[PDB]
């Protein structure tokens, strides 16, 4: 579902993608 279309990642998009892609810090928090 949707590849690396190098779409404009404006911080948040950049956040989700950062994850979708690799992940990041933890994203758990409430988990």
């Amino acid at each position: 579902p949707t590849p690396e279309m190098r779409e404009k990642l404006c911080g948040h998009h950049f956040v989700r993608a950062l994850v979708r892609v690799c992940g990041g810090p933890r994203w758990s928090t409430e988990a």
Binding site: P3, E4, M5, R6, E7, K8, L9, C10, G11, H13, F14, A17, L18, V19, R20, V21, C22, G23, G24, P25
Partner: peptide, 26 residues
């Protein structure tokens, strides 16, 4: 090896899972 601010840089143009693959802390 690092670059500018990825958050800003991808905001204007965008970033591939490759960029993001190297922007993660893992």
């Amino acid at each position: 090896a690092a670059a500018t601010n990825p958050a800003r840089y991808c905001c204007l143009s965008g970033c591939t899972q490759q960029d993001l693959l190297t922007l993660c802390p893992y």
